[PDB]
């Protein structure tokens, strides 16, 4: 319908909701999962050395 100055305010809200996830949500979330990814990956090499 109508163009509106909302079109800037929403960019201002958008980049902030981006920042609040960038440096503070995803690195923690995926790192805590990488720890687990390794910890199930290691079991195979553990039994592998046990077999060797």
């Amino acid at each position: 319908m109508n163009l509106n100055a909302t079109i800037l305010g929403q960019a201002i809200a958008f980049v902030l909701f981006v920042l609040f996830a960038m440096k503070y949500v995803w690195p923690p979330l995926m790192a805590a999962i990488e720890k687990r990814q390794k910890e199930i990956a290691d079991g195979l090499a553990s039994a592998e050395r046990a077999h060797k």
Binding site: S46, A47, R49, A50, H51
Partner: protein, 52 residues
Amino acid sequence: DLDLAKASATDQLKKAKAEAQVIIEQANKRRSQILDEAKAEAEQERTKIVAQ
């Protein structure tokens, strides 16, 4: 499993070291029996060859 694998490896090696060495020991006991029986046969033969 990482623990019991080395457990079983070590307890296998133990048994190997034990019974290989009893093999080698019995080989020399068998020697001794054979060589002393050869001593007896030697003397017995001399007893005839002299009386001849």
